[PDB]
């Protein structure tokens, strides 16, 4: 899955 756009926390982590 593509999600390497600066993101990762309490939401989809």
Swiss-Prot record:
<comment type="similarity">
    <text>Belongs to the eukaryotic ribosomal protein P1/P2 family.</text>
</comment>
<comment type="function">
    <text>Plays an important role in the elongation step of protein synthesis.</text>
</comment>
<protein>
    <recommendedName>
        <fullName>Large ribosomal subunit protein P2</fullName>
    </recommendedName>
</protein>
<comment type="subunit">
    <text>P1 and P2 exist as dimers at the large ribosomal subunit.</text>
</comment>
